[PDB]
Every structure is written in C-alpha cells, then in structure tokens.
Amino acid sequence: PIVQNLQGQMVHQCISPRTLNAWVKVVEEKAFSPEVIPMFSALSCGATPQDLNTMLNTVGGHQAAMHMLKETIDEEAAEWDRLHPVHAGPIAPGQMREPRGSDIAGTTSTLQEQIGWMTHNPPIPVGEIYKRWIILGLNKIVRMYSPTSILDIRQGPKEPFRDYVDRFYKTLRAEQTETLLVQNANPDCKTILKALGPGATLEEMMTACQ
Amino acid sequence: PIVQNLQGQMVHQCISPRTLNAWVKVVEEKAFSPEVIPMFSALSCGATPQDLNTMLNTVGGHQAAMHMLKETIDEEAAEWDRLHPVHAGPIAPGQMREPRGSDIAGTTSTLQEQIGWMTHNPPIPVGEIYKRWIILGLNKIVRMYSPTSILDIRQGPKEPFRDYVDRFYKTLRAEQTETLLVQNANPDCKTILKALGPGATLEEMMTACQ
Amino acid sequence: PIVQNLQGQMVHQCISPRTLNAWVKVVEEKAFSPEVIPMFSALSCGATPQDLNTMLNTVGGHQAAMHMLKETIDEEAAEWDRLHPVHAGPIAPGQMREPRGSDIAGTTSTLQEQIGWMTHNPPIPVGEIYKRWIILGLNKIVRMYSPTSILDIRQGPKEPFRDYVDRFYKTLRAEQTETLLVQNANPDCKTILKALGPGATLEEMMTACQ
Amino acid sequence: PIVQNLQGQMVHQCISPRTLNAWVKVVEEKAFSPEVIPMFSALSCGATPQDLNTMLNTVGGHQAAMHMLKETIDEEAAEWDRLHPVHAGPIAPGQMREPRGSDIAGTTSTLQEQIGWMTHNPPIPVGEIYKRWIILGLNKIVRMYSPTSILDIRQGPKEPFRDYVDRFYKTLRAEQTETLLVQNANPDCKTILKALGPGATLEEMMTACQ
Amino acid sequence: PIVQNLQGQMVHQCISPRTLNAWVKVVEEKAFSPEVIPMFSALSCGATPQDLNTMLNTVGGHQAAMHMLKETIDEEAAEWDRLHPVHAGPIAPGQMREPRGSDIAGTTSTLQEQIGWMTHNPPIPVGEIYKRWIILGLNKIVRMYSPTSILDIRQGPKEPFRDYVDRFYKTLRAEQTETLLVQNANPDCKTILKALGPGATLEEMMTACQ
Amino acid sequence: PIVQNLQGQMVHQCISPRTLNAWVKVVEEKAFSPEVIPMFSALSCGATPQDLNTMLNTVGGHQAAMHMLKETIDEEAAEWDRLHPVHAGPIAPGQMREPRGSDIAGTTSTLQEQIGWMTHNPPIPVGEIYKRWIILGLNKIVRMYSPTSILDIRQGPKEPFRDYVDRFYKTLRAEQTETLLVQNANPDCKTILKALGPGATLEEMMTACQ
Ligand SMILES: CC(C)(C#Cc1ccc(-c2ccc(Cl)c3c(NS(C)(=O)=O)nn(CC(F)(F)F)c23)c([C@H](Cc2cc(F)cc(F)c2)NC(=O)Cn2nc(C(F)(F)F)c3c2C(F)(F)[C@@H]2C[C@H]32)n1)S(C)(=O)=O
Ligand SMILES: CC(C)(C#Cc1ccc(-c2ccc(Cl)c3c(NS(C)(=O)=O)nn(CC(F)(F)F)c23)c([C@H](Cc2cc(F)cc(F)c2)NC(=O)Cn2nc(C(F)(F)F)c3c2C(F)(F)[C@@H]2C[C@H]32)n1)S(C)(=O)=O
Ligand SMILES: CC(C)(C#Cc1ccc(-c2ccc(Cl)c3c(NS(C)(=O)=O)nn(CC(F)(F)F)c23)c([C@H](Cc2cc(F)cc(F)c2)NC(=O)Cn2nc(C(F)(F)F)c3c2C(F)(F)[C@@H]2C[C@H]32)n1)S(C)(=O)=O
Ligand SMILES: CC(C)(C#Cc1ccc(-c2ccc(Cl)c3c(NS(C)(=O)=O)nn(CC(F)(F)F)c23)c([C@H](Cc2cc(F)cc(F)c2)NC(=O)Cn2nc(C(F)(F)F)c3c2C(F)(F)[C@@H]2C[C@H]32)n1)S(C)(=O)=O
Ligand SMILES: CC(C)(C#Cc1ccc(-c2ccc(Cl)c3c(NS(C)(=O)=O)nn(CC(F)(F)F)c23)c([C@H](Cc2cc(F)cc(F)c2)NC(=O)Cn2nc(C(F)(F)F)c3c2C(F)(F)[C@@H]2C[C@H]32)n1)S(C)(=O)=O
Ligand SMILES: CC(C)(C#Cc1ccc(-c2ccc(Cl)c3c(NS(C)(=O)=O)nn(CC(F)(F)F)c23)c([C@H](Cc2cc(F)cc(F)c2)NC(=O)Cn2nc(C(F)(F)F)c3c2C(F)(F)[C@@H]2C[C@H]32)n1)S(C)(=O)=O
Ligand SMILES: [Cl-]
Ligand SMILES: [Cl-]
Ligand SMILES: [Cl-]
Ligand SMILES: [Cl-]
Ligand SMILES: [Cl-]
Ligand SMILES: [Cl-]
Ligand SMILES: [Cl-]
Ligand SMILES: [Cl-]
Ligand SMILES: [Cl-]
Ligand SMILES: [Cl-]
Ligand SMILES: [Cl-]
Ligand SMILES: [Cl-]
Ligand SMILES: [Cl-]
Ligand SMILES: [Cl-]
Ligand SMILES: [Cl-]
Ligand SMILES: [Cl-]
Ligand SMILES: [Cl-]
Ligand SMILES: [Cl-]
Ligand SMILES: [Cl-]
Ligand SMILES: [Cl-]
Ligand SMILES: [Cl-]
Ligand SMILES: [Cl-]
Ligand SMILES: [Cl-]
Ligand SMILES: [Cl-]
C-alpha cells in the first residue's frame, strides 16, 4: 500500500503477511456474507491496484464469483474510458500519463506508475477508483449468493422476537422495512405491535414483544 | 485512526488487521456483555468515523442490535443538528465546513473531510463525537439484553457468599446497592451482616460471611 | 499509554490490542494468584488513568473483587484529597489544575487533562499514582482469595522436600519463614534439618533432605 | 528485502520470521495451486536474490518441482547473458559491475552487490528480474501439476450451476472459455443458456440456471 | 528495557506483552532445563532491574527455586557492597548516587534511578549486573534439579550410539568428557572406539559406531 | 542483531521473541533436515556472535550434534588464528583489537566488542564469519543424519514418477544426478526415458513418464 511515513511523505509499503493472511482467512470462513465487504475495504486501506489484484488472486475457490468480479471491473473500466479519453502527447517531465481503465485495474500499468499516480500532487487515486469497482462487483456477488428473500423471513409461533428480528435484518442486509417487520411477526406479537401504533422504535417494538 | 507520528504530527493510519480481528472476535465471544463496551472504546482509540463504521460493519449477526444502534445514532445526529445548525457561506481556504450529524456519522462525509476535522487546530473530534453516540447506543443494547433483574439475585442457602456477590454485581453492572446486597443474602449470612452494622465495607462483609 | 517517541517527546499512544488481550487472558487463567499483580503492572506500563480503567473494565466476572477494588480506590483517593487540597484560582496559561483523587482515578478528568499532567515538566504521574492504588487494592484481593494458611502447609511423610517447599512458599506468597519451614517438615527431614543447625541456606536444606 | 526507511532512503532489511513462516506454510497447505503464485510475489515484495533463494530453500519436499525451477532459472539466466554480455573493464568508483545471469540468481553475487544493484540510481532490479524468472518457473509447475483438463469439467445432471462454474474456472485457472462453459453444462441448463443468446454475462448465465 | 531509539539516544521502553508471555511460557514448559538460561538472557536483553523483577515475579510456581534465587541475589548484593562502599556526600547536579546491592536488585531503587544509571555516560549497567546475579542463581537451580549423574549415562546394549551421545551431553550440560563417553559405551562400540585411538573427533566416533 | 536504523546508522537491537521462538520451533519440528540451514541463516540475519550463541543454546536436545558443532567451530577458529595472528601493541583510540577465533565465536569477546567490530568502518563482520562456521558445521550434521543413500532411491513398479523424483532429489539434497535418475527409474519409465535421448529436461522427463 501507499502509506505516509512518520515524516509526512507518501511512500510505498510491502503488503504485510498479516494483511494477506487475514483476507484469505475471511473468505474461507465467511465466503460472501455481507460483512466480507468491510473487511476487504479495511484490509486494502491505501492499497495500490497491484495490492488489490494480489488480494483477489490469493483467493482460492469461488472462481465463479471471481470471474463475475472481472466482468464488473471490465464494465467499470470501459465506462472510465468513455468518460476519460486519454489525450495524445508527450508526458511532461515529472508528470504522469492519464490512466486508462486497464491501468486503474493494474493490467496495463506498472507498480511504479501506480505509485506515481497515487503520490502525485494532486494524486490520482487509482487504488481507490479500483477498490470502488471491486466493492461494486463484490456487492453484486453478495446479493446473488443471498439464499433467502425477505418475504420468507417470518417469526415462528414460539420464536422469540429478538431471534426473528436478528434473522430479518440479516436477510435484509444481504438482499440490499419497518412495516414488513410487523407483517411477518407471529400473531401474538403482531397484535402487540398493532397497539403500539406507528412511529415506534425497534427498541420499543422489541421491548413490547419480549 | 488518526495517530501522532513519532515527530509530532497527527496523520491518518490504516486500521490494523489486529484491531479489526479483535473487535470481530470479542463480539462473537462476549456478544453484548458489559465488558464489550470498554473493548470497543479501546479498540477504536483515535478512530475516524470511517473506522467506526468499518468496525460496526464487520459484525456479522446481532443485526437486531445493530439496527437499534443506527436508530440511536440517528437520534443523536438529529440532536446534533438542532444544536449546531450549519451556516451558509463559502468555506475559507485551509478551513473545514461545519459538520452535520450525518457527517459525524460518516454517511455524508469523506475520509479526507474527517481527517480535516480531526487534525484541525483546534480539532473537531468527529470521531470521539461519533464514538460517544455509539457507546450510548451500545449501553442501551447491553441493558436490553441483560437477562436477569437484580431483585432475582438471591444467595443460595449453601451458596458461598463470594459466589453470590459475584453474581450480584455482575447482574448490577448489566442492569446499570449495599442494602439490597444484605437483603438478598441467605438467612445465615444476613444475621452476620446485621450484627456488622451499617457502613461496613464489602471486604468486611465478605470476610464476615466466609 | 504515554510513551516517548523515538525523537524524545512524551506523546500519547493508543493501548494496543495485544496489551488489552493479554490482560483479559491473564485474569481468565490465573484469576487472583499473586503473579497477576506483576502482569498488571507490566501490561499497564506508562498507562494513563483512562488506560487503567479500560483494563479493569475489560475484566468480565470477579465483580465482587472489582467492587472491593473500587472501595480501595475511593479510600486512597479520599486520602489524596486530605493531603492535597485543591487551591482556588485561575490556572495559568500552559499549566494544569491540581488533580483531585477522582481526577487521578479518571472519573472526573479527561484524557487530555491526564496527558497534560503526565507530560508536564515536572510531570504529575497520575497514572502511576492510580496504578499504586490499584495494586494496593489488588494485593488485598489476592490476600483474601488465598485459600490456605501457612500453618496448614505440612510436608507429607513420603512427600519430596522440594514439592513441600514449593507449596510452602507458594502459600506464603499469597498470604503475604525459615523456622516454620523446618517445623512443618516431616519427621525424617526435620531430624536432618535439626543437625544442619541454624543459618543454613534453603539450598543447603533442600540438598540435605533430598 | 530492500525497503525505504521512513526518511526516504532504500536500505536493506532482514527478512522477518513472519514472512519466512508464511511462505513455508502456504507451500505445505496449498502446494502448487494457482493461488500460491500471488502469495509468493506478495511475500517476496522488495526481496533481494538472497531473500528469494532463502524462501525457495526453506521449502521442504516438492524437490521435483524445485529442481524444475532451477532449470527454468538456468534457462532464463542464460538468455539474460545472451542479451546482456558483461563488458571488460575496471568498475568506476561508486559504480556496480554489470550483473550476469548467475549474479541475478544469487549464485555468483554477494548480498552487498545485490544491495548495490538494487539501490543504484538508476537501480538494477536484480530482485525483480530474479522473481520474474521464478514466477515463470512456478507457473510451469502449477500447469504441470494441474490434474484435470477443462474438457473434463462437465456439469452433473443434478449439480447446481454455481458449483459447476466454480469447478470450471478453478480448472481453467490451473490449466492457464465462454462457449465451452455452455457446451459442458447439463441438458437442462444448456437449453436455458441457448435461449439467452450470445453476449450474456456470467451473472446472467448463473441467474438463468439457478 | 533501555533501548536505543532510531536516532541514537538510549530511552526507556515498556516491556512488551510478547516478551512477558514468552518468559512465562518457557518456564511452564521447560521448567529449569539448561536451555531456559539462554531464553532468560535473550528475553531480558537491555532489561532494567525493574524488568528483571517483573519477569521473575510473573513466574507462578517453582517458588522453592525462586526463593533460592533471592538468597543468591542477597549473597551477590552483599558482595557488591563489600567491594563498592557508598561514599557520603551530596550528589552533583546531573549525576547519580553510587548504587548499593539492593539498588541493583531493584529493591531500594526507583525506575528513574535505574534509567539514570543505565543511560549515564559512562553508564552503570545495573541491569546487566543484576542479570548476572540472576543467571548465577539460575545456574545453581539448573544444577540442583539435574536428575541424573553423568556416571549413570551408559549406552544400552542395542541402543544406537547417536541416542546415547544425545543423552550423555544432555546430562553433562545440566550437571555443568571424552574418555568417559567411551567408557560408558556398550561393549560393541567400545571395541570400535578403542581401535580408533585417542584424538578422534565426536563425528569420527559417531561414524564408527553407527 | 546489528540493524540499520531508519536514519542510516548501524545500531544493536535485542533479538526478538519471534526470532528466538521460530528457531526453537524449527529445530523441534524439522531437526536437521536440509531446509533447517536456510531458516538458521535467515533467522540470524545480522546476528552478532552473542545472538548466534543464544540461538544455539536455546536448542534443547540434539546435544550430540550441538557438540559436533562446537568441534567444527574450534576447527574453524583455530584455522582463523593460523591465518590471522594478532599483533601486539596498544589499540589506537576509537579502534578495535584484531579478533581471535575465540572472539569471533563469542567465547572471549564481549557484546560491546562485537558491536565495535561489526559497526567499524570498514566493519569486521565477526557475526558473518561465525555464522559461516556454524553453517559449515550444520551441513556436516545434516549430511551425517541423512538416513538413505541416493543409490537406494529406486522407483517402485507402480510408483508415480513424480513421487519417485520427489524422493530422489530430497535424498540427494541431504546427501549433498541426471543419469542416475534414469537408471533408478522403473522398467516402464526407463524405456520411455531411453527413447527421449540425452539432454532432456526434468520437465520433459516427468511429462514423458506420467
Ligand atoms: C463498506 C464500507 C466502505 C461502508 C460503510 C458505511 C457508511 C455509513 C454507515 C452508517 C453509519 C451510521 C448510520 Cl445511522 C447509518 C445509516 N442510518 S439509516 C437508519 O439507514 O438512515 N445508514 N447507514 C449506511 C449508509 F450510509 F449507507 F446510509 C449508516 C454504514 C453503516 C454502519 C453501521 C453498521 C452497524 F452494524 C450498526 C450501525 F449503527 C452502523 N452500515 C450499515 O448500515 C449496514 N447495514 N445495512 C442494513 C440493512 F440493509 F439491513 F438495512 C443494516 C445494516 C446494519 F446497520 F448493520 C444493521 C442490520 C441493519 N456503513 S466500510 C466503512 O464498512 O468498510
Ligand atoms: C467505557 C469507558 C470509556 C469507561 C470508564 C470508567 C471511568 C471511570 C471508572 C471508575 C474508576 C475508579 C472508581 Cl473508584 C470508580 C467509581 N467508584 S464508585 C464506588 O462508583 O463511586 N465509579 N466509577 C465509574 C464512574 F466513573 F462512572 F463513576 C469508577 C470506571 C470503572 C473502572 C473500574 C472497573 C473495575 F472493574 C474495578 C475498578 F476498581 C474500577 N468502571 C466501573 O465501575 C464499571 N462497574 N459498574 C458497576 C456497577 F454498576 F455494578 F456498580 C461495577 C463496575 C465494577 F467496578 F466493574 C464492579 C462490579 C462493579 N470506568 S473505558 C475507560 O472502560 O473504556
Ligand atoms: C509487583 C512489582 C511492582 C514488584 C516488585 C519487586 C521488587 C523487588 C523484588 C526483589 C528482588 C530481589 C530480591 Cl533478593 C528481593 C528480596 N530479598 S529478601 C530474601 O526478601 O530480603 N525481597 N524482594 C522483594 C522486596 F523488594 F519487596 F523486598 C526482592 C521483587 C521480588 C523479585 C523476585 C522474584 C522471584 F520469583 C525470585 C527472585 F529472586 C526475585 N519478588 C518477590 O520476592 C515475591 N515473593 N514474595 C515471597 C514470599 F512472600 F513468599 F516471601 C516470595 C517471592 C518469590 F521470590 F517469588 C519467592 C517464593 C518467595 N519484586 S513487579 C516489578 O513485579 O511488576
Ligand atoms: C501474480 C501477480 C503478479 C498478478 C497479477 C494480476 C494482474 C492483473 C489482473 C487483472 C485484474 C482485473 C481484471 Cl478485469 C483482469 C482481467 N480481465 S479479463 C476478463 O481477462 O480481460 N484479466 N486480468 C489478468 C491479466 F491482467 F493478466 F489479464 C485481470 C489479475 C487478476 C486479478 C483478479 C483476480 C480475481 F480472483 C478476481 C478479479 F476480479 C481480478 N487475476 C486473474 O485473473 C487470475 N485468473 N485467471 C483466470 C482464468 F485463467 F481462469 F481465466 C481466472 C482468474 C480469476 F479472476 F481469479 C477468476 C476465475 C478466473 N492479476 S499478483 C498481483 O497476484 O501477485
Ligand atoms: C547463557 C549465554 C549468556 C551464553 C553463552 C555462550 C557463550 C559462548 C559459547 C561457545 C560458543 C562456541 C564454542 Cl566452540 C564454545 C565452546 N567450545 S569448547 C569444545 O568448550 O572449548 N565452549 N563454549 C562455551 C564457553 F564459552 F563457555 F566456553 C562455546 C556458548 C555455547 C554456544 C553453543 C551451543 C551449542 F548448542 C552448540 C555450539 F556449537 C555452540 N554454549 C554451550 O557450549 C553449552 N553447552 N555446554 C555443554 C557441556 F557442558 F555439556 F559440555 C554442551 C553445550 C552444547 F554446545 F550445547 C553441547 C552439548 C554440549 N555459549 S547465551 C549467549 O546463550 O544467552
Ligand atoms: C543456505 C543459504 C545461505 C543459501 C543458498 C543458495 C544460493 C544460490 C542458490 C541457487 C539459486 C538458483 C539456481 Cl538456478 C541455483 C543452482 N542451479 S544448478 C542446476 O545447480 O546449476 N544451484 N544453486 C545453488 C548453488 F548456488 F550453490 F549452486 C542455485 C540456492 C538454491 C536456491 C533454490 C532452491 C530451490 F528449492 C529451488 C530453486 F530454483 C532455487 N538452493 C538449492 O539449490 C538447494 N538444492 N540442492 C539440491 C541438490 F543437491 F539436490 F541438487 C537441490 C536443491 C533444490 F533446488 F532445492 C532442489 C531439489 C534440488 N541456494 S540461504 C540463501 O538459503 O539461506
Ligand atoms: Cl506482519
Ligand atoms: Cl498489477
Ligand atoms: Cl483456484
Ligand atoms: Cl429483547
Ligand atoms: Cl497487525
Ligand atoms: Cl464512512
Ligand atoms: Cl449479517
Ligand atoms: Cl472471600
Ligand atoms: Cl497489537
Ligand atoms: Cl477515564
Ligand atoms: Cl461482568
Ligand atoms: Cl532438590
Ligand atoms: Cl516478525
Ligand atoms: Cl544468495
Ligand atoms: Cl528436502
Ligand atoms: Cl447463483
Ligand atoms: Cl507485543
Ligand atoms: Cl523494581
Ligand atoms: Cl505463586
Ligand atoms: Cl550418526
Ligand atoms: Cl516479537
Ligand atoms: Cl557471547
Ligand atoms: Cl539440553
Ligand atoms: Cl507430473
């Protein structure tokens, strides 16, 4: 990644074994649960495009999702090229060529060029642009691998309301609400929630059905 | 987080895999026991609003509590806006716009803006303001998930006083005392504690009933 | 904690996940064995009052002892106030108000004030003052949870002297010696230790009874 | 490796136990799966030829592949010598002799010489040149140890399409595509994929056969 | 410990949780095997007397040995006082009082005084003086807990010579050689070692009896 | 070890618990397999003679090999003294006495002297000289503990060629080749390898017999 040294200069740093290992492990354990997106964004803090490609490549398995991820990256890269056409001309001394979509995705660009963009003044955050494309593609993967629709999350007749709400917002998060939460509650809690009226907080709802 | 480098300047640092992993693990193991609040405050030392949102998002499960947490944040953000209305005008060079509630909660603000507020002179500690809102909301979650009332913590007839006091203050902490501690002691220890008189220390009480 | 950077200035540092985790684990494993006091002092090296309160709060369980710890802190804080009454007056620019007992214990003081005291010239080591109160209170807890009196540590008739001495000084340490060590030895070793005479070293005693 | 200190100078650093251990472990667990190449490139970030040889030597087992790796290195080194013949002459003060293939592969060069090349201005990245040769040789090993041909990856009659696509691109990656993916789908999904037409995305294909 | 910062000044550092934990673990696992002495010396690199006392205090159990260790320290401290009598007089500004035995052992000295001695020019290495006393006392403990005499290490009639030599020098190290190694070899290997003659290396001896 | 600080000065560093622990563990797990030599060289990067002796002393067990290691060190030290006789004379201010063999092996030299040699300009790398002697002695240990001769590595009649080549070069490495690899192949693969002709690569040989 590109970190600021303790003197105030942005320099390149090798990705640490701890960072590499945490990413690999979170995919093995959590696959494409929603909370894998924040881990990816946090672990790739300050990442160059090379670091991002490293992290994606260390994933073994899930190659169907990884391939869908490439197609999303190609979609976003092609959109970047339609909005930012590279102008012909010799690059001035101490300056950087404009990045293409494939340069941001690290396929036609070197690490030294990525460092040049990211440490430019003003910087071209090719790492953050690429990370956004990846998180976009990861969100579609999370959505596709969501097993259950919110319409099928219904409170059991003897299911504690807390457990039901846990399953409800867990499902909702992956599908990516208030009145449906009441409608899918069991008869005994729905009656209590009816009498609470509208505008009740979740805490008030949970307190009323416990 | 925003740390001070070893030269004396406040700079941004990537959240470390150790910090991310410790937070995730403490929620898996301890859920919403009271001691999860100090871990959250310590792990988010110097955190930006983005880091705080990262930590909350890495939580898988407990989505009922996580949703109640958002409602508390929205309550606190809306109160921040009623007390701090943003004034219209162009921001002066080298200065920061006033933060709204949603900027403090990281929903309408960028990392660069959060760094600008937090490293301003004087700084606007949007991270500490947001952390306070979260700890406020976490405390209500801890209180709601407290299973047992202090009125039901009674010493067993052959229960060692030490074990009873352990359960008593554990329950008290989650519910968030002296005379009730005597009243709920078993007959044999209550008689001893009566004769100790008032103003006895816990150490004196424990010594008298062991 | 307040560490000295590699340039020679005392600056504040976030408590590390390693430090937090080690303290929690040592309490889970060792409870209030005597060797938990050195771990606490070493782990809270350079700690502010906030860090000390963090560490104590991360403890789950043992709330009877934790409450006795507060009473010892209140005793010591009140003694600090009787010896150091805060004088009325406006604090001069660049100076710190005198700390009260509750400021040292972090209940009425902010982190910024604690940093001001601890990095003052000369510094007011509110962290070390608070740590002393805590270690004082922890010692009383260790003493109270000591199960066995030294009078009941007697060498078994076929117990190796080494094992006996191990149990003896282990018990002695928690209770917090030479002639009692002989008196509680078994008949066969006591006869040997009699003939050694007084002023023998432990190594001489152990060698004589092995 | 050769890292840039926090002041801006490229200096040599001892390879860390974490880096050494991660490489050894990834070979024990993953052998020569494709994702072992990115781990090798990431763990040897900034590596000198000595560090690269260290990492390869810490591998126990797989000595058949390790020997094939040497033959690839010798092939590449000999090609380097045919393209870069070392010119005779005394090396000027403060300058470095031109590297031979065997100097890049660390067999006829010292660490001090490798540091001289890598920290030269402009630098001769003997580490990156050597790493490229190794990754080249590792790719041939991954290809040779690929057990299954893409022609044998066929969807089972009741196999979920997602699982099939996972096996397909996993196999494809090791062998190192769209129309073959349809042809090897089972009859029921092939009929659906026929009607989708050409130019469908993988996400559209997966959605249509789930 | 007292480390040199990356600028060239000797400053105090908190003992790290890793250092504390490694020492505790090595005592639990290896007790007083000989190789515990090098671990102690390496883990207490640069240690102050306070750090040394911390490490010894974190040991739970083995209190018989720990008490023998104090008696050795008192012996060495008293010898230090007989060779270095403290002269009466006011200490000059910026200078340190001469250390007594009990100051070196950290019982009558503060951390600030230990830092003053250790960072003086020339420094008084009270940490290294104390560490020497401890290693002296630890060596006597290792010697006392050595279970077997070298006279009882005899090669079994079908015991491989390598295994025998392993047990021999292991025992010798704890007891703290060549001709006895031959004498205790079994008849078949002794005959071979006789014919080798004197002045044979261990490698020659092992090769001859394998 | 002697590391270069982030400012460009060679200073001494305490050996880290991670380094100590990794060395101990690799000996417990791998004993004297060949790949233990690279781990030793990597873990002792920049090591002083004291650090090297520390690492060797932390080894418990294998004392037969450890003693053979001392004899190799004494051989090499005595050769160093025959090639570098120390000249009599007072050492000039700011200079270092010439090292003897026993000074390089850390037996008659202090840490401060080792730092003086290693940080001299030009430096006397007593650490690297000592490490070379140790690696020399470790290689003889690896060779002696090699169980199987290369003449006994023969491909089984139904053994996959890959597995055979794995055992072959593993054995060869410890014994420390092409035509013997063919001669020891089973009849079916030998016939194929005959027809390949000479000058075939290992990859061609493996491909032909799979
Ligand atoms: C990936 C990344 C770059 C980012 C970001 C990112 C940025 C901003 C915000 C956010 C912050 C505060 C508030 Cl009050 C709201 C809000 N208040 S509201 C009422 O909607 O108006 N909304 N937001 C999202 C915003 F900004 F997009 F609007 C927020 C979040 C929250 C952070 C958060 C997580 C948490 F657990 C508990 C919290 F209190 C806050 N994360 C989510 O909310 C995810 N989530 N989704 C849903 C669902 F879909 F089911 F409803 C559900 C959640 C849930 F909260 F977990 C919970 C079960 C409900 N994250 S990062 C930093 O992680 O690496
Ligand atoms: C989250 C965060 C930002 C913070 C803070 C924070 C700030 C200040 C203080 C504190 C410090 C010293 C004293 Cl003497 C008192 C006091 N003395 S008193 C008699 O009340 O007048 N009170 N306080 C709270 C104050 F300041 F709010 F008043 C304190 C605490 C204590 C720290 C502490 C924990 C501990 F274990 C043992 C200690 F000796 C001190 N924590 C609590 O006390 C929590 N607790 N709650 C209750 C209950 F409700 F059951 F009674 C019980 C506890 C308990 F102690 F654990 C024990 C069973 C009893 N924490 S952080 C730094 O953790 O990240
Ligand atoms: C908490 C903290 C801030 C502190 C400190 C602290 C400060 C000083 C000293 C100390 C140092 C050297 C000597 Cl020679 C003596 C001494 N010599 S003597 C003969 O008494 O006159 N006394 N002391 C205590 C002093 F200074 F208070 F006097 C010491 C200790 C010792 C350190 C130590 C531990 C150890 F294991 C072995 C050692 F060789 C030295 N620790 C204790 O002795 C604890 N202990 N208690 C008893 C008992 F009660 F049973 F007798 C027993 C021990 C025991 F040694 F473990 C052993 C079974 C016997 N610690 S910290 C740095 O840990 O974080
Ligand atoms: C070793 C090292 C130095 C390097 C590099 C390196 C350099 C660039 C790129 C890359 C980046 C973005 C795009 Cl969009 C494409 C592209 N888009 S495309 C449609 O082809 O035109 N192609 N590339 C390769 C390029 F550049 F060579 F063209 C890329 C990769 C990708 C990174 C990546 C991995 C991932 F998992 C998911 C992603 F979204 C992106 N890695 C691979 O693709 C490996 N892979 N191989 C195949 C197969 F063969 F089966 F098809 C398959 C993959 C797969 F993606 F995993 C997935 C199942 C399919 N890595 S490092 C940095 O790791 O240490
Ligand atoms: C604690 C500390 C501060 C220190 C130090 C310290 C200082 C110097 C030396 C040393 C170095 C090189 C040589 Cl050649 C000799 C030597 N050559 S010789 C022939 O005697 O003349 N002698 N020495 C000791 C010296 F200097 F004191 F003379 C040495 C050692 C050796 C280091 C070593 C360990 C090892 F495993 C293998 C090695 F090749 C070298 N350690 C020991 O030898 C311990 N040991 N003891 C005996 C026994 F008693 F059985 F014989 C046995 C050993 C043994 F080697 F393990 C092996 C089975 C035999 N350590 S530290 C740095 O560890 O933290
Ligand atoms: C200890 C230390 C200081 C050092 C060093 C050190 C220094 C240089 C080299 C080296 C580098 C590149 C090439 Cl191409 C050759 C070469 N090409 S060749 C055809 O012979 O002419 N030779 N060398 C040794 C040189 F330089 F001495 F010649 C090399 C090695 C190789 C590194 C390596 C390991 C590996 F696994 C795979 C590689 F591609 C390269 N290590 C070895 O080869 C060890 N080995 N031994 C044998 C055997 F004996 F069976 F044949 C076998 C190996 C084996 F490769 F593992 C494999 C099964 C065969 N290490 S360190 C840095 O580790 O800490
Ligand atoms: Cl790491
Ligand atoms: Cl790349
Ligand atoms: Cl794969
Ligand atoms: Cl509830
Ligand atoms: Cl980390
Ligand atoms: Cl954010
Ligand atoms: Cl979830
Ligand atoms: Cl009690
Ligand atoms: Cl940490
Ligand atoms: Cl506080
Ligand atoms: Cl609790
Ligand atoms: Cl004994
Ligand atoms: Cl490390
Ligand atoms: Cl090399
Ligand atoms: Cl091997
Ligand atoms: Cl799907
Ligand atoms: Cl640590
Ligand atoms: Cl001390
Ligand atoms: Cl104890
Ligand atoms: Cl042998
Ligand atoms: Cl470490
Ligand atoms: Cl030494
Ligand atoms: Cl041993
Ligand atoms: Cl093969």
How far is CA A53 from each of CA A179, D38, F55, rounded to the nearest angstrom? 42, 9, 39
B136 lines ligand 2 (CB under 6 A): no
Kindly report the three-state secondary structure assignment for every residue of D84-110. Answer: CCCCCCCCCCCCCCCCCHHHHCCCCCC
Contacts of residue D85, Cβ cutoff 8 Å, sequence gap at least 6? none
d(CA B91, CA B140): 38
CA C197 from chain centre, in angstroms, equals 36
Q: Which ligand is nearest to the CA of A144?
A: 22
Report the nearest-CA residue for atom 2 of ligand 5.
E38
Q: Mapping DSSP to helix (H, G, I), strand (E, B) and coil, where does residue C4 land? A: strand
8-state DSSP, B4: E
CB B44, CB B146: distance < 8 Å: no
How far is CA D44 from each of CA D19, D49, D127, F133, rounded to the nearest angstrom? 8, 10, 9, 28
What is the widest separation between alpha-carbon atoms in chain B?
74
Report the residue from D14, D16, D54 with minimal CB separation from F1: D14
Nearest residue in chain A measured CA to CA from D162: A64
φ, ψ at A2 (rounded to 5°): -105, 105
DSSP assignment string, F47-62: --HHHHHHHHHH--S-
d(CA D88, CA B32): 73
Query: In which residue are the tokens 């805060």 written?
Result: C86
Query: In which residue are the tokens 């449906």 written?
Result: A180
What residues are paired with E10 via a beta bridge? E4
Number of H helices, E strands in chain A: 11, 2
Task: Give residue numbers after which chain B breaks (C–N above 2.5 Å).
Answer: 176
d(CA F37, CA F42): 9
- Encoded amino acid at D42, one letter: A
Kindly report the three-state secondary structure assignment for every residue of chain E. Answer: CEEECCCCCEEECCCCHHHHHHHHHHHHHHCCCCCHHHHHHHHCCCCCHHHHHHHHHHCCCCHHHHHHHHHHHHHHHHHHHHHCCCCCCCCCCCCCCCCCHHHHCCCCCCHHHHHHHHCCCCCCCHHHHHHHHHHHHHHHHHHHHCCCCHHHCCCCCCCCHHHHHHHHHHHHHHHCCHHHHHHCCCHHHHHHHHHHCCCCCHHHHHHHCC
Query: In which residue are the tokens 């440490």 written?
Result: A119
B162 labelled ligand-binding? no
D173 lines ligand 6 (CB under 6 A): no
Give the residue from B166, B49, B44, B40 showing the smallest Cα distance to B109.
B49
Give the residue from F57, F66, F58 showing the smallest Cα distance to F32.
F66
Q: D190: alpha, beta or left, given left = phi > 0 and alpha = psi -120 to 50? A: alpha
Contacts of residue D98, Cβ cutoff 8 Å, sequence gap at least 6? D84, D86, D87
Chain F residue numbers with beta carbons less than 8 Å from the beta carbon of D144 are: 203, 206-207
CB contact under 8 A, C35 and E59: yes
* Inter-helix orientation angle F17-30/F36-43, to 10°: 170
Number of H helices, E strands in chain B: 11, 2
8-state DSSP, C10: E
- Encoded amino acid at B31, one letter: A
How many other C-beta atoms are found inside a 10 Å radius of the C-beta of residue C67?
21
Q: How many CA atoms lie within 13 A of C194 on its CB side?
A: 9
How many other C-beta atoms are found inside a 10 Å radius of the C-beta of residue B80?
19
> Both tokens of residue A46?
């300050």
CB B64, CB A173: distance < 8 Å: no
Give the residue from A185, A80, A90 showing the smallest Cα distance to A124.
A80
| Angle of CA points E195, E196, E202, to nearest 5° | 140
What residues are paired with C11 via a beta bridge? C3
CB E132, CB E79: distance < 8 Å: no
- Encoded amino acid at F191, one letter: T
CB contact under 8 A, B165 and C64: yes
d(CA C149, CA A71): 74
* Ion ligand 25 nearby residues (CB, 5 A): C 170, 173; E 60
- Encoded amino acid at B32, one letter: F
Give the residue from C47, C31, C41 showing the smallest Cα distance to C144.
C31
> Both tokens of residue D54?
């260290």
DSSP alpha helix (H) spans, chain F:
17-30, 36-43, 49-58, 63-83, 101-104, 111-118, 126-145, 161-175, 178-183, 187-196, 202-208
Mutate to test the interface with F, among E203, E204, E209 (most CBs of F within 10 A): E203
List of chains touching C (3+ CB pairs within 8 A): B, E
Report the residue from E11, E53, E67 with minimal CB separation from C4: E11
C-alpha torsion sign, points D195, D200, D201, D204: negative
CB A133, CB A73: distance < 8 Å: yes
How far is CA D11 from each of CA D47, F6, F10, rounded to the nearest angstrom? 12, 8, 11
8-state DSSP, F89: S
